Amino acid sequence: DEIFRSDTLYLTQDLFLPFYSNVTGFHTINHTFDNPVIPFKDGIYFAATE
Amino acid sequence: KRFQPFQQFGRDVSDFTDSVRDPKTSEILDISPCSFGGVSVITPGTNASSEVAVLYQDVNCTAWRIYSTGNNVFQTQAGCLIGAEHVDTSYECDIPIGAGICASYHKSIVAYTMSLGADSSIAYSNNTIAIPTNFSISITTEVMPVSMAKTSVDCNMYICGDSTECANLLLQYGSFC
Amino acid sequence: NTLVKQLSSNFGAISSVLNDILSRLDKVEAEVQIDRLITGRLQSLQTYVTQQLIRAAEIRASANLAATKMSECVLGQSKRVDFCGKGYHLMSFPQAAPHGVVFLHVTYVPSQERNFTTAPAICHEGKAYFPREGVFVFNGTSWFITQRNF
Amino acid sequence: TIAIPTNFSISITTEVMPVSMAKTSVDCNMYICGDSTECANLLLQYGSFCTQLNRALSGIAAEQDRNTREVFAQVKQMYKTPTLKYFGGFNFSQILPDPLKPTKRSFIEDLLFNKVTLADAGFMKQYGECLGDINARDLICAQKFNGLTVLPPLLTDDMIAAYTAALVSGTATAGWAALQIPFAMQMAYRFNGIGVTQNVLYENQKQIANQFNKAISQIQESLTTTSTALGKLQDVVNQNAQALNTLVKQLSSNFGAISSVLNDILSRLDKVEAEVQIDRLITGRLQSLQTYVTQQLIRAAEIRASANLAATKMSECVLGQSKRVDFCGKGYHLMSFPQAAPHGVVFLHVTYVPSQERNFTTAPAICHEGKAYFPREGVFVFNGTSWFITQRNFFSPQIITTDNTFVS
Ligand SMILES: *[C@@H]1O[C@H](CO)[C@@H](O)[C@H](O)[C@H]1NC(C)=O
Ligand SMILES: *[C@@H]1O[C@H](CO)[C@@H](O)[C@H](O)[C@H]1NC(C)=O
Ligand SMILES: *[C@@H]1O[C@H](CO)[C@@H](O)[C@H](O)[C@H]1NC(C)=O
């Protein structure tokens, strides 16, 4: 949220990425170029290491 | 407190808004309640007198946070006391103020330190012993409760009176009777 | 009397008087307010019952101790200290009282203590003659053997 | 065959018992409706369940003061410390106050107080102090701002220490309104009460004193190190704090309303619409207060049961010798000493423990010349040379005589 909080523990229900869940990897190099259409499925987490 | 740009208000665990960013100057401010502190009232009974004494637990009067200052403001262990005269003598604690302080009505309200009991010294002697030579017969009383009054409740009487519609609503509610 | 007085209170309803609601409101609209009142009044009854149970437990603890006193003090002599009176206990008598019992304890109280020189044992002729449950006291003329009391 | 002991030991054991709990008060208009005037009027046009709750709480507080009075105020006359601390080889230091140390409490009492951690050293918190320390999330400030208060006990800790010192001084001299007897002499009387003969005490006095002082030192060494011995008088403390902080936290909860924050509702809703939500919140918060009060009453009953048993122990064990089994210590009971502790009392019981049992052949009666000479409260044992008459405890053989036995 946009509320400020300090030194406390706060519980919330929301769409999150569960801990120790599977993530798919796509690697782009000269040999292989990957750009498939990926489903959205109620939101996504996207990480780029480059 | 340090506020991020997208924040405007701050809340505590009880969800009471305790911080606010000033719109014009962007300065963080803390919001605190105004009412705070404990109060107690000592009286000897309306029939005896109309005067009372007032004790403030969270004030040290050697001041500002008191309703009035009638006379004799003096600091005790229990807190700041207003309306009582202090007496050095020890007594038997008619009214317990607290922290070893008691009050009584002597004609004014007086406050004193609590008296534990009579003071005596017993000698220790290796070669001496005391034995009684007389005796007395004392009769003492002890009062102890045994039973209390037995009661019953008609819940349809207490709830819904003689009304038939409320009784049906009570029915289409639940049987906690 | 507190239960009686609590009927005056509204519990979020427009009125505490049921007859007014039924007089000037139709069934569906009256249902809401009557349900609010029902909830509040049931809650009051439950609070009363809980407090009665706690008081009853206290009274039970008091009654058991009184029964123990009757068995121990009235029908016997008790050697427990301060159970059946402050002094040494001799006898006790019960009297009935409204919702309770009053015990009269009769006790022995020593008085007029006098100081003597005391010996634990007597060398006599280089032997040890121990008192056998009494105190050796020196009256001024010769040594004597006495009880702790009287 | 029958076995009889030939030796004995002096053991000192401790028992910890709670006496009172913290006294509290609630400002219901503070906890419910804050400083808002409209919510106060709605509270008014609801009901007065605040008078009942506070009547119950005040009763509890008075009961706590009464509990302490009944445990510690048995002694009528106060008895000055003898200044000698030594009686017949027994060291009563570390149980009595030391003039050199400024504090009026004893060494063991100091250890006990140090062990138990207490939430509040003092009962005053000033408004300016709460304001200045806003950065720290002080729990007491949060309790106070929401209408919850803790009240000080009537009897200060130094007073309880004085009562305990008077009781110990009375035990040391005059025994259990004064008898005036030498320590060693009285100790001889306790042995008789047990059943052992006086000469046993007088002959072996130095060994018994060494053992006693020694047990005291072990108690001290056991308390110096950290243990869960005083756990009960800690559980009691944590329970109270936990209940108050739980009441503080419960204000965050909605009770079917749109928000838990009253100021938001009043800011963005008109009177009639705000009334519904405020009534829901009022109902919920009153319910929380009632639950807290009920739990406090149940805890108070438990503490009352504990205080009465402690008072009975003080009367029976400290001011007398008890023949009840295991009431004032595991072994045969001789004496007991009280020490004050935070919200409770610690009893030190001194007991006689038999040891080194030896087996002899036993006879119930002696035919002698076709007659029956019964022991008269002793056992007939065969040592190997001739028959002897002895006690149940601490084997001491005596020649059989007509006086020792009774004919039948
Ligand atoms: C609002 O007006 C005041 C006075 O002109 C000014 O100091 C302040 O900066 C203004 N607000 C902002 C955040 O610019
Ligand atoms: C009251 O204030 C005075 C002066 O600051 C201080 O010396 C005294 O200790 C205070 N009393 C208490 C018990 O806080
Ligand atoms: C009593 O104990 C103290 C401290 O342990 C010791 O100094 C003293 O010698 C002992 N007895 C006496 C009075 O000698």
Residue numbers in the entry:
A (entry chain C): 44 to 93
B (entry chain A): 543 to 604, 618 to 661, 672 to 742
C (entry chain A): 942 to 1091
D (entry chain C): 693 to 868, 874 to 1105
The authors write:
The trimeric spike (S) glycoprotein decorates the surface of coronaviruses and mediates entry into host cells. S receptor binding domain (RBD) comprises a free fatty acid (FFA)–binding pocket. FFA binding stabilizes a locked S conformation, interfering with virus infectivity. In the prefusion conformation, the RBDs in the S trimer can alternate between closed (“down”) and open (“up”) conformations.
To elucidate LA binding by SARS-CoV that emerged 2002, we determined the S cryo-EM structure. As before, we did not supplement LA during expression or subsequent sample purification and preparation steps. We analyze SARS-CoV S by cryogenic electron microscopy (cryo-EM) showing that LA-bound SARS-CoV S adopts a hitherto elusive locked structure sharing characteristics with LA-bound locked SARS-CoV-2 S, incompatible with ACE2 receptor binding. Locked SARS-CoV S is stabilized by LA occupying a bipartite binding site composed of two adjacent RBDs in the trimer. One RBD contributes a “greasy tube” lined by mostly phenylalanines accommodating the hydrocarbon tail of LA, and an adjacent RBD coordinates the polar headgroup of LA via residues R395 and Q396. LA binding to S also induces a profound conformational change in the loop comprising residue R620, which then engages in a cation-π interaction with Y819. Residue Y819 is part of the fusion peptide proximal region of the neighboring S subunit. This conformational rearrangement is completed by a π-π interaction of F305 and Y622 in the locked conformation. Another stabilization of the locked S trimer (and closed S trimer) is achieved by R1021 residues in each subunit, which form the center of a symmetric H-bond cluster, cation-π interactions with F1024, and salt bridges to E1013.
